DNA sequence: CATTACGTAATGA
DNA sequence: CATTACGTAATGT
């Protein structure tokens, strides 16, 4: 009957949506980790370049 | 007290709504953090390049 | 107490 | 079809 096949299609889609949202969350936390170490390396670079500018003698 | 099953269910349904609200807010705040770090890394990269061009200009 | 998989029905327009 | 909120039950996330 149509009811059971519509329900099974949705039951499959709800699982798929949930697995996909779990995937995006892992990917988003990865992204926060990569952007944060990039941020820290860029800050080290700025500090080091600023210090050279500030102490250049010629 | 009487009907402990319904007491526990009523309290758990509260915990569940609370947990789901919090998870949504954690999700928002994480996306905002990605935005923030992305725009800050952009700013930091322009700074590295503008400092570098200044050193290049001064040294040769 | 907080967290999460499950099936369902509504939303989406 | 994809997404979301719900209440339940199991479980220590």
Numbering used by the authors:
A (entry chain B): 283 to 340
B (entry chain A): 281 to 340
Excerpt from the publication:
We then examined the DNA binding specificities of the C/EBP protein family of proteins and found that both C/EBPα and C/EBPβ also show a preference towards recognizing the TTACGTAA DNA motif. This finding was further confirmed by our structures of C/EBPα and C/EBPβ in complex with the TTACGTAA DNA. Our ITC results showed that C/EBPα and C/EBPβ bound to the TTACGTAA DNA with a Kd of ∼0.354 μM and 0.018 μM, respectively, which were 1.4- or 3.8-fold stronger than to the TTGCGCAA DNA, i.e., the reported consensus binding sequence of C/EBPα/β. To understand why C/EBPα/β prefers recognizing the TTACGTAA DNA, we determined the structures of C/EBPα and C/EBPβ in complex with the TTACGTAA DNA, respectively. Surprisingly, our binding results showed that C/EBPα bound to the TTACGTAA DNA of ∼8- to 20-fold weaker than NFIL3 and C/EBPβ. Although C/EBPα exhibited a conserved binding mode to DNA in the basic region with C/EBPβ, we found that C/EBPα carries an aspartic acid, D320, in the leucine zipper region, which is a glutamic acid in the corresponding position of the other C/EBP proteins. Structural comparison showed that the shorter side chain of D320 in C/EBPα prevented it from forming additional hydrogen bonds with N321' in the other monomer, unlike E111 in NFIL3 or E309 in C/EBPβ that formed a hydrogen bond with N112' in NFIL3 or N321' in C/EBPβ from the other monomer. Mutating D320 of C/EBPα to E enhanced its binding affinity by ∼5-fold compared to the wild-type C/EBPα.
pmcThe CCAAT/enhancer-binding protein (C/EBP) transcription factors belong to the basic region-leucine zipper (bZIP) family of transcription factors, which play crucial roles in tissue development, cell proliferation, and differentiation. In humans, ten C/EBP transcription factors have been identified, including six C/EBP proteins (named C/EBPα-ζ), and four C/EBP-related proteins, TEF, HLF, DBP, and NFIL3 (8, 9, 10, 11). The bZIP domain consists of a basic region (BR) and a leucine zipper region with a sequence of heptad repeats. The leucine zipper region is responsible for the dimerization of the bZIP domain, allowing the bZIP proteins to form either homodimers or heterodimers.
